[PDB]
Structures are given as structure tokens and as C-alpha cells.
mmCIF file of C-alpha atoms in Angstrom:
data_model
loop_
_atom_site.group_PDB
_atom_site.id
_atom_site.type_symbol
_atom_site.label_atom_id
_atom_site.label_comp_id
_atom_site.label_asym_id
_atom_site.label_seq_id
_atom_site.Cartn_x
_atom_site.Cartn_y
_atom_site.Cartn_z
ATOM 1 C CA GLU A 6 -26.738 -3.259 -233.888
ATOM 2 C CA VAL A 7 -24.117 -5.032 -231.227
ATOM 3 C CA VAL A 8 -21.604 -2.321 -231.095
ATOM 4 C CA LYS A 9 -18.240 -5.798 -230.673
ATOM 5 C CA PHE A 10 -16.169 -5.331 -227.446
ATOM 6 C CA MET A 11 -13.518 -4.925 -229.758
ATOM 7 C CA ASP A 12 -14.501 -2.654 -231.660
ATOM 8 C CA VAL A 13 -15.408 -0.551 -228.940
ATOM 9 C CA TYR A 14 -12.312 -0.967 -227.037
ATOM 10 C CA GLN A 15 -10.314 -0.167 -230.122
ATOM 11 C CA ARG A 16 -11.477 2.648 -230.573
ATOM 12 C CA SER A 17 -12.001 4.606 -227.701
ATOM 13 C CA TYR A 18 -8.883 3.325 -226.479
ATOM 14 C CA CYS A 19 -5.979 7.251 -225.960
ATOM 15 C CA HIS A 20 -5.346 8.155 -229.139
ATOM 16 C CA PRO A 21 -4.862 11.655 -230.852
ATOM 17 C CA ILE A 22 -9.583 12.620 -231.353
ATOM 18 C CA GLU A 23 -11.043 16.129 -233.087
ATOM 19 C CA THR A 24 -12.449 17.814 -230.438
ATOM 20 C CA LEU A 25 -13.909 21.351 -230.172
ATOM 21 C CA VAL A 26 -11.347 24.023 -227.768
ATOM 22 C CA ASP A 27 -12.980 27.192 -226.141
ATOM 23 C CA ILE A 28 -10.433 29.598 -227.106
ATOM 24 C CA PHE A 29 -10.496 30.788 -224.355
ATOM 25 C CA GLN A 30 -9.224 28.105 -222.228
ATOM 26 C CA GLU A 31 -6.655 28.205 -224.953
ATOM 27 C CA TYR A 32 -5.810 31.956 -224.200
ATOM 28 C CA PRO A 33 -6.099 32.061 -220.111
ATOM 29 C CA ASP A 34 -5.093 35.195 -220.345
ATOM 30 C CA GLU A 35 -6.755 37.236 -222.729
ATOM 31 C CA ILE A 36 -9.864 39.534 -221.202
ATOM 32 C CA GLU A 37 -9.531 41.834 -223.709
ATOM 33 C CA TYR A 38 -11.500 39.961 -227.237
ATOM 34 C CA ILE A 39 -14.204 37.408 -228.327
ATOM 35 C CA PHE A 40 -13.805 34.925 -230.739
ATOM 36 C CA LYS A 41 -15.435 33.825 -233.752
ATOM 37 C CA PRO A 42 -16.575 30.921 -233.249
ATOM 38 C CA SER A 43 -16.320 30.287 -229.940
ATOM 39 C CA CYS A 44 -13.804 27.378 -230.282
ATOM 40 C CA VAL A 45 -12.021 25.424 -232.118
ATOM 41 C CA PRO A 46 -11.688 22.112 -233.605
ATOM 42 C CA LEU A 47 -8.647 20.616 -232.462
ATOM 43 C CA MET A 48 -6.792 16.939 -232.619
ATOM 44 C CA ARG A 49 -6.193 16.268 -228.687
ATOM 45 C CA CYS A 50 -5.670 13.150 -226.368
ATOM 46 C CA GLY A 51 -8.778 11.654 -225.788
ATOM 47 C CA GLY A 52 -9.750 8.064 -224.188
ATOM 48 C CA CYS A 53 -9.037 5.794 -222.331
ATOM 49 C CA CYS A 54 -5.812 3.495 -220.890
ATOM 50 C CA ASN A 55 -6.246 -0.157 -219.919
ATOM 51 C CA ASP A 56 -5.027 1.223 -216.315
ATOM 52 C CA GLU A 57 -7.926 2.752 -214.208
ATOM 53 C CA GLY A 58 -4.659 4.706 -212.962
ATOM 54 C CA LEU A 59 -2.942 6.360 -215.760
ATOM 55 C CA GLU A 60 -4.154 8.693 -217.439
ATOM 56 C CA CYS A 61 -3.579 9.245 -221.939
ATOM 57 C CA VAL A 62 -1.129 12.443 -222.670
ATOM 58 C CA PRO A 63 0.615 13.551 -224.942
ATOM 59 C CA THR A 64 3.743 12.226 -226.176
ATOM 60 C CA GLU A 65 4.355 15.107 -229.769
ATOM 61 C CA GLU A 66 1.974 17.989 -230.214
ATOM 62 C CA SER A 67 2.556 21.038 -232.590
ATOM 63 C CA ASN A 68 0.653 24.076 -233.384
ATOM 64 C CA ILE A 69 -1.423 25.163 -235.721
ATOM 65 C CA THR A 70 -2.509 27.922 -237.312
ATOM 66 C CA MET A 71 -6.290 29.447 -238.171
ATOM 67 C CA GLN A 72 -8.208 32.915 -239.268
ATOM 68 C CA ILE A 73 -9.135 34.118 -236.161
ATOM 69 C CA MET A 74 -12.458 36.643 -235.967
ATOM 70 C CA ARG A 75 -10.748 38.804 -232.786
ATOM 71 C CA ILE A 76 -13.567 41.085 -232.043
ATOM 72 C CA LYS A 77 -12.800 44.280 -228.764
ATOM 73 C CA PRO A 78 -16.788 44.632 -227.977
ATOM 74 C CA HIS A 79 -18.149 47.923 -228.946
ATOM 75 C CA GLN A 80 -14.651 49.143 -230.400
ATOM 76 C CA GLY A 81 -13.833 46.601 -234.131
ATOM 77 C CA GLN A 82 -13.789 42.801 -235.220
ATOM 78 C CA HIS A 83 -10.560 41.629 -237.597
ATOM 79 C CA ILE A 84 -9.246 38.835 -239.198
ATOM 80 C CA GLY A 85 -6.817 37.831 -237.059
ATOM 81 C CA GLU A 86 -3.690 34.410 -237.146
ATOM 82 C CA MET A 87 -3.715 32.789 -233.782
ATOM 83 C CA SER A 88 -1.462 29.162 -232.551
ATOM 84 C CA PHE A 89 -2.988 26.671 -231.657
ATOM 85 C CA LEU A 90 -1.556 23.347 -229.978
ATOM 86 C CA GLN A 91 -2.475 19.399 -230.659
ATOM 87 C CA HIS A 92 -1.755 16.433 -230.269
ATOM 88 C CA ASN A 93 0.208 14.073 -232.466
ATOM 89 C CA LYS A 94 0.424 11.047 -230.288
ATOM 90 C CA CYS A 95 -0.528 10.136 -226.900
ATOM 91 C CA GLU A 96 0.493 7.386 -224.362
ATOM 92 C CA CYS A 97 -0.709 6.269 -220.775
ATOM 93 C CA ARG A 98 1.226 7.996 -218.149
ATOM 94 C CA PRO A 99 1.259 7.916 -214.572
ATOM 95 C CA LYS A 100 -1.810 10.061 -213.002
ATOM 96 C CA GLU B 6 -0.977 26.010 -243.727
ATOM 97 C CA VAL B 7 -3.503 28.652 -242.437
ATOM 98 C CA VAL B 8 -6.984 27.191 -241.760
ATOM 99 C CA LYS B 9 -8.886 30.090 -243.865
ATOM 100 C CA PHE B 10 -11.519 31.783 -241.155
ATOM 101 C CA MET B 11 -15.205 29.964 -243.272
ATOM 102 C CA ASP B 12 -13.419 26.732 -242.488
ATOM 103 C CA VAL B 13 -12.815 26.373 -238.674
ATOM 104 C CA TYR B 14 -16.361 28.763 -238.850
ATOM 105 C CA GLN B 15 -17.970 26.034 -240.332
ATOM 106 C CA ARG B 16 -15.905 23.001 -238.546
ATOM 107 C CA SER B 17 -16.494 24.363 -234.713
ATOM 108 C CA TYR B 18 -20.248 25.424 -235.250
ATOM 109 C CA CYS B 19 -22.312 23.181 -232.988
ATOM 110 C CA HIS B 20 -23.123 19.945 -234.430
ATOM 111 C CA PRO B 21 -22.836 15.937 -232.987
ATOM 112 C CA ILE B 22 -18.877 14.797 -233.181
ATOM 113 C CA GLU B 23 -17.531 11.660 -231.283
ATOM 114 C CA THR B 24 -16.923 12.306 -227.782
ATOM 115 C CA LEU B 25 -15.049 9.331 -225.733
ATOM 116 C CA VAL B 26 -17.062 9.560 -222.877
ATOM 117 C CA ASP B 27 -16.959 8.148 -219.145
ATOM 118 C CA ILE B 28 -18.868 5.235 -218.297
ATOM 119 C CA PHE B 29 -18.732 5.653 -214.121
ATOM 120 C CA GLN B 30 -20.484 9.041 -215.245
ATOM 121 C CA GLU B 31 -22.654 7.575 -217.703
ATOM 122 C CA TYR B 32 -23.622 5.215 -214.715
ATOM 123 C CA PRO B 33 -22.727 6.436 -211.373
ATOM 124 C CA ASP B 34 -24.646 3.368 -210.065
ATOM 125 C CA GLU B 35 -22.157 1.330 -211.160
ATOM 126 C CA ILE B 36 -20.329 1.795 -208.058
ATOM 127 C CA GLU B 37 -19.068 -2.112 -206.931
ATOM 128 C CA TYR B 38 -17.903 -2.820 -210.614
ATOM 129 C CA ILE B 39 -15.205 -1.635 -212.765
ATOM 130 C CA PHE B 40 -15.513 -1.636 -217.020
ATOM 131 C CA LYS B 41 -13.191 -2.645 -219.600
ATOM 132 C CA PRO B 42 -12.738 -0.305 -221.471
ATOM 133 C CA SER B 43 -14.024 2.622 -219.064
ATOM 134 C CA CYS B 44 -15.015 4.724 -221.361
ATOM 135 C CA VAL B 45 -16.572 4.514 -225.374
ATOM 136 C CA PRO B 46 -17.148 6.241 -227.823
ATOM 137 C CA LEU B 47 -20.830 8.446 -228.842
ATOM 138 C CA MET B 48 -21.879 11.074 -230.659
ATOM 139 C CA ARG B 49 -22.326 13.860 -228.066
ATOM 140 C CA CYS B 50 -23.321 17.616 -229.084
ATOM 141 C CA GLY B 51 -20.199 19.528 -228.875
ATOM 142 C CA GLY B 52 -18.852 22.570 -230.762
ATOM 143 C CA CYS B 53 -20.077 26.122 -230.154
ATOM 144 C CA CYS B 54 -22.856 28.619 -231.161
ATOM 145 C CA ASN B 55 -23.003 32.108 -232.338
ATOM 146 C CA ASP B 56 -24.373 33.865 -229.390
ATOM 147 C CA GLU B 57 -22.252 33.423 -226.017
ATOM 148 C CA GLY B 58 -25.752 33.061 -224.095
ATOM 149 C CA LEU B 59 -26.800 29.938 -226.072
ATOM 150 C CA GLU B 60 -25.973 26.492 -225.758
ATOM 151 C CA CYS B 61 -25.328 23.692 -228.057
ATOM 152 C CA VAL B 62 -27.869 20.851 -226.248
ATOM 153 C CA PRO B 63 -29.308 17.709 -228.589
ATOM 154 C CA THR B 64 -33.071 17.796 -229.419
ATOM 155 C CA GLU B 65 -32.640 14.352 -231.141
ATOM 156 C CA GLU B 66 -31.757 10.834 -229.297
ATOM 157 C CA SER B 67 -31.196 7.717 -229.831
ATOM 158 C CA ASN B 68 -29.623 4.988 -227.735
ATOM 159 C CA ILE B 69 -27.060 2.435 -229.406
ATOM 160 C CA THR B 70 -26.062 -0.708 -227.498
ATOM 161 C CA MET B 71 -22.088 -2.567 -226.712
ATOM 162 C CA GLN B 72 -20.073 -4.886 -225.187
ATOM 163 C CA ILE B 73 -18.569 -4.127 -222.549
ATOM 164 C CA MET B 74 -16.095 -6.683 -220.125
ATOM 165 C CA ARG B 75 -17.509 -6.076 -216.532
ATOM 166 C CA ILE B 76 -15.082 -6.434 -213.969
ATOM 167 C CA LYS B 77 -15.593 -7.471 -209.998
ATOM 168 C CA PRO B 78 -11.603 -6.706 -208.687
ATOM 169 C CA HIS B 79 -9.753 -10.539 -207.890
ATOM 170 C CA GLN B 80 -13.213 -12.018 -208.285
ATOM 171 C CA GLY B 81 -14.057 -12.512 -212.069
ATOM 172 C CA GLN B 82 -15.534 -10.960 -214.668
ATOM 173 C CA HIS B 83 -18.206 -10.861 -217.481
ATOM 174 C CA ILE B 84 -18.836 -8.991 -221.558
ATOM 175 C CA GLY B 85 -22.191 -8.294 -221.437
ATOM 176 C CA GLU B 86 -24.077 -5.193 -223.456
ATOM 177 C CA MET B 87 -24.341 -2.037 -222.187
ATOM 178 C CA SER B 88 -26.567 1.144 -223.554
ATOM 179 C CA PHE B 89 -26.112 4.224 -224.363
ATOM 180 C CA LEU B 90 -27.770 6.938 -225.058
ATOM 181 C CA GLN B 91 -26.230 9.088 -227.992
ATOM 182 C CA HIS B 92 -27.511 12.504 -229.818
ATOM 183 C CA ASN B 93 -28.706 12.745 -233.497
ATOM 184 C CA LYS B 94 -29.214 16.025 -233.893
ATOM 185 C CA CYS B 95 -28.675 19.472 -232.312
ATOM 186 C CA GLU B 96 -29.769 22.830 -231.728
ATOM 187 C CA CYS B 97 -28.202 26.405 -230.393
ATOM 188 C CA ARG B 98 -30.375 26.945 -227.361
ATOM 189 C CA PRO B 99 -30.984 30.136 -224.875
ATOM 190 C CA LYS B 100 -29.139 28.952 -221.608
#
């Protein structure tokens, strides 16, 4: 059935949403290890703003710790804790 | 609490996830108008695969109809129906 306007509007407005984030994006200086899984689920700001000139960005954020399989190609692999930023609150701010 | 490896691994693996998608991306021929909301919530394949050479892609798809406000700037606006593609099933396939 057809999704009603106010439902679409409220569901898509700027807010934290579970987002699958590549670990290399979070750790852009990593050039030694590869990771399993290669991505992690994190709450991140997403969606749209009333004003098209605004973007959805975090106003509160905090880290979560996840166990990741850290692989050194052709050498070995280890379960290790890694920290990832999550967004707790979002707002629409000038782009 | 530290998220356990097997929990992260299972939660991040290739599957359909709610994704906030920009309308003008899905409909690049809609030049003359703007839309409210400007993005919509859609189930889309997301997450990661066991092999860096694989990608998460849809194997089953369907459409969904949503009420969206179509706006002609400083002229007028109308609530109409628009159809969007969703992903119902995903698999990891060779890029």
C-alpha cells in the first residue's frame, strides 16, 4: 500500500540511523592490516533537512568498542578491540 | 560493553537495510522540481562480504509507492505518488 506523506516525511528526516561503515573509512591511515568483517554497523546521522541548503550532521557523538579480526596478510590474525564513533544526536546545519 | 566479534560479524554481513535515498538521485530527469521530503527510506542491500573481491548486490527486487510533495519553486506544490525500487534479497557476488 501507499506510504502516507507524513510517514515518509518523519521517517526520512535527519536522525541517527544504523549505517554500515567500512573500517578503512574510520581508520584511513591503516595500511598494514585488513579486517574481518570489513565493515561495522554504527549509528550515524542520515536523512534530509527542510532546507535543501542544510546537511544532517552530528551534535553529540560517542565511541563504541567492537572486537574485530585484525589480519596481517600472509602473517596471521588476531581478535582485537577497536573503537568506532557513533552519532547520538543530529541537526541540520549550513552546508 | 564491548561488542563481541561474532555479533559484529553477523550484523554487518550483506543484507537489505533501511537506507535513506535522495530522490533526485533515483530520478535525475526531475530537474524542474524539488521534493519534500527530498529523500526517502528504502530497503537496499548493504554491508560487507567475506572476500574483498565480492560486493553485496540485490537478487530480488520490488517497488514501493510513496506520497511525496512535488514543488515548483515560487509557483506551487502538490502531493503526488512516486514509485521507488527496493531490494528484498541480497547476495555477495564477484565484482
